[PDB]
Write a protein that binds this ligand. Structure first.
Ligand SMILES: COc1cc(C(=O)[O-])ccc1O
Ligand SMILES: COc1cc(C(=O)[O-])ccc1O
Lengths: 183, 188
């Protein structure tokens, strides 16, 4: 359902073949809602069967009127917050299963993972503000000019959220490394 | 695989029937790695079939009580030693925010206010869990401490606390992010 919503959002930037959709998805919205080539391809086919997409041969998918309607309905609805599935938090809760040295290794890897995430998110923000990110560029060319500021600002906001979470994860792991000094 | 690791960790606090495991899981490790009753029951059956768990029929009708075998203790230690694999992000609120232009700024403010309320509630839950952990009376923690050498008790508790401090850290970051989004929406 949520993968469908992310595909509707992606396809509102313009029509795409399944292969191109898979490529553009992973370079854009896949950073906040991941989807692989084996998930995207059958969902696109299902959305076409449910008449949310129109298929045209160039096999290239475009939103139908029902697809635009489904996009707007999906966004209007409140977020349904799923339960937490955090492998690093699970690991940390049971660090006593291993050594303090193991725990430091895990916490250092946590820091490195989210420091890399921060670099990736900040680079994405640079491309969004430069308006040259390929999916954003297509979106802007097909969007009213009065909407461009909001369109870019909300993409930036999403990646600022990735950065905020990453920073909290880094400082949490730093506090854990200090905890390990004592016990 | 990760659900199996969470169940091994839970059952290292002591043997449990599947029903008791289900209830205890949801009030302990389920707050960091969620597991439904329909996910937990078949995973325990599989773990017993693979001899990571010993099943013993107990009066409860009889029910199967699951306990770690030596193979299960080895699987638990091995699972913890391996590096974490960081899955790809699937964050519904971040996805919503990325495409707030689908609706009105009023819709977006409603979403962001809901984000704040969700994580302020999670902070209360996490802080209450830390109180129960430090009091040593959380039911799974108490069972675990009963079966653990005294020299390890402070370490055991501290790591549970550390996990929920991470839940609080994340929740606070989500609140601060949503609050800056609300300020953005003032100007857009
Ligand atoms: C949500 O992430 C993105 C979305 C878009 C888009 O759909 O225009 C472009 C770049 C992104 O990084
Ligand atoms: C990981 O979350 C918890 C774990 C335990 C435990 O296994 O002893 C107890 C309480 C918890 O909140």
């Amino acid at each position: 359902m949520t993968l469908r919503s992310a595909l509707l959002a992606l396809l509102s930037s313009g029509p795409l073949t399944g292969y191109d959709a898979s490529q553009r998805f992973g370079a854009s919205v896949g950073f906040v809602w991941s989807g692989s080539d084996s998930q995207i391809y059958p969902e696109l086919r299902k959305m076409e069967a449910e008449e949310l997409l129109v298929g045209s041969d160039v096999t290239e998918y475009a939103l139908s009127e029902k697809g635009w309607e489904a996009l707007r309905k999906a966004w209007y609805e409140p977020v349904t917050y799923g339960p937490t599935r955090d492998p690093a938090r699970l690991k940390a809760a049971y660090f006593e299963v291993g050594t303090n040295g193991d725990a430091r290794r895990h916490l250092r890897a946590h820091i490195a993972h989210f420091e890399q995430q921060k670099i990736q998110s900040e680079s994405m923000i640079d491309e969004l503000k430069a308006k040259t990110h390929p999916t954003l560029a297509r979106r802007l060319e097909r969007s009213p000019k009065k909407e461009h500021e909001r369109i870019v600002a909300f993409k930036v906001l999403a990646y600022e959220g990735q950065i905020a979470r990453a920073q909290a994860e880094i400082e949490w792991a730093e506090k854990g490394l200090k905890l390990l000094d004592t016990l």
